[PDB]
Amino acid sequence: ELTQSRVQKIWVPVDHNSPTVIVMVGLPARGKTYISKKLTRYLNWIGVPTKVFNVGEYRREAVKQYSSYNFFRPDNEEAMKVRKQCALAALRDVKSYLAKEGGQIAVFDATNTTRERRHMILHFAKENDFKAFFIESVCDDPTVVASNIMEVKISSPDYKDCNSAEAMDDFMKRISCYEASYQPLDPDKCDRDLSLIKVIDVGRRFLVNRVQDHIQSRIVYYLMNIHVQPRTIYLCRHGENEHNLQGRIGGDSGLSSRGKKFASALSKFVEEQNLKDLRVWTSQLKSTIQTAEALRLPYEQWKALNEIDAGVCEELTYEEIRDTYPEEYALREQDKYYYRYPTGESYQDLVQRLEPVIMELERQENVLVICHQAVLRCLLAYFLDKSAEEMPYLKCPLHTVLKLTPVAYGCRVESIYLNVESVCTHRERSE
Numbered sequence: 001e002l003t004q005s006r007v008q009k010i011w012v013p014v015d016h017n018s019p020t021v022i023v024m025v026g027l028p029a030r031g032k033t034y035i036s037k038k039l040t041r042y043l044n045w046i047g048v049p050t051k052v053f054n055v056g057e058y059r060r061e062a063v064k065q066y067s068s069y070n071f072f073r074p075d076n077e078e079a080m081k082v083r084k085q086c087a088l089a090a091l092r093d094v095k096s097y098l099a100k101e102g103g104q105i106a107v108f109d110a111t112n113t114t115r116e117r118r119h120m121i122l123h124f125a126k127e128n129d130f131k132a133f134f135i136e137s138v139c140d141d142p143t144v145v146a147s148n149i150m151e152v153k154i155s156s157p158d159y160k161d162c163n164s165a166e167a168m169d170d171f172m173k174r175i176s177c178y179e180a181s182y183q184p185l186d187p188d189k190c191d192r193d194l195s196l197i198k199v200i201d202v203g204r205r206f207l208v209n210r211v212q213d214h215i216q217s218r219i220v221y222y223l224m225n226i227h228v229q230p231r232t233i234y235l236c237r238h239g240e241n242e243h244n245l246q247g248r249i250g251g252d253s254g255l256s257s258r259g260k261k262f263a264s265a266l267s268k269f270v271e272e273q274n275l276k277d278l279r280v281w282t283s284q285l286k287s288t289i290q291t292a293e294a295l296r297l298p299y300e301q302w303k304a305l306n307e308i309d310a311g312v313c314e315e316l317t318y319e320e321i322r323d324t325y326p327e328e329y330a331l332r333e334q335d336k337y338y339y340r341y342p343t344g345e346s347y348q349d350l351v352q353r354l355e356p357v358i359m360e361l362e363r364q365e366n367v368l369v370i371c372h373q374a375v376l377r378c379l380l381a382y383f384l385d386k387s388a389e390e391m392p393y394l395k396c397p398l399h400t401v402l403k404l405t406p407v408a409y410g411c412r413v414e415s416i417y418l419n420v421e422s423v424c425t426h427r428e429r430s431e
Ligand SMILES: Cn1ccc2ccc(-c3cc(Nc4cnccc4C(=O)NC4CCOCC4)cc4nccnc34)cc21
Pocket: 029, 030, 031, 034, 035, 137, 138, 139, 144, 145, 148, 151, 152, 199, 201, 202, 203, 223, 224, 226, 227, 228, 229, 230, 231, 406, 407, 408, 409
């Protein structure tokens, strides 16, 4: 016999591959940490457990505050010993994360600019049975380097007792400390056997060598879709709909009278925002489409943006679900991310179908996504680096636009309520 597990609905028989170390490579202020973080955010959200080990954070913990670039001098015998021990301590943690804590990918975020340092990470990987994948960021444009420094270096803890001008100055010399011994990845000759991507001039061009597995090709694909241009992402739900007024889930009802006032308000908001080339996306459910109709803009529908499928519970109230399917109600409340409605979906299923939405979102600039409660949560979690456990409980009120702006290494979210009443469909984590 086979039995169907209670939360996920997976048929199982009755009782009766290598982790990867991703090695960042490059001079300081080349976006290594920007990429480390963003990538880790994508990987975790698609369900590959990933963690960043930034050697700089180890050095900052092992050493009294930073005073100047002299700490990074190649003739600094003692700082060198410290730096090397910081790398080894980060690797100890990498071993722990991947071999014992269920980690899948560890991103070793450091300059790792010498063949020697990289050879040692390889030895580490090889003897723990970890795959190694290198990502190098190369850029010689001073404008880009300057910008990076202004944007994330001068505000860092290292420079808290320095003004801008002198953080910038210190950082420039800090970089020059690494230049003499920098051996770029060389896939033609000495690195022909390594798996790596060398990125040149901020994603303009890539060198890819020996992709070993699906995580690696997928990272390359991700890296070819992202960009660093400023832009804005607006996320909202459909205007209130008739099923909302009844506390009924799922279905494909139309906008209520308030829902229509929202749409009209949303149109005003969008106009006042004054964007160029704002793309608009909806699901294929009517609520969403009517809402976009009020904007008088071109929009495109995506079945992927359709609300979670409640299967056999579609169109019931939560009340009716507790009465009719008491046991299914409880299972969901106890594990709301992995719980699969019977005949239906989990939040986990949602991530899989939203993955192509995220990938296209990364390619776009200004976008307005009009969608549904659970879908919105799933997208929002991606942008705000929220865990699978939290995602089902993020708050996405009706008639409220969430305005997301890339800033520094992450994302500012700004809530904008359009002053139209609605019922509340938020349901707290109960225990
Ligand atoms: C699009 N893409 C694909 C691969 C890849 C690798 C590195 C980078 C990359 C990204 C990058 N980005 C930042 C680094 N530090 C701080 C901030 C950014 C950054 O993206 N800032 C932007 C945020 C959005 O608004 C405009 C400014 C800087 C780089 N500098 C030199 C070389 N590469 C850089 C971009 C990449």
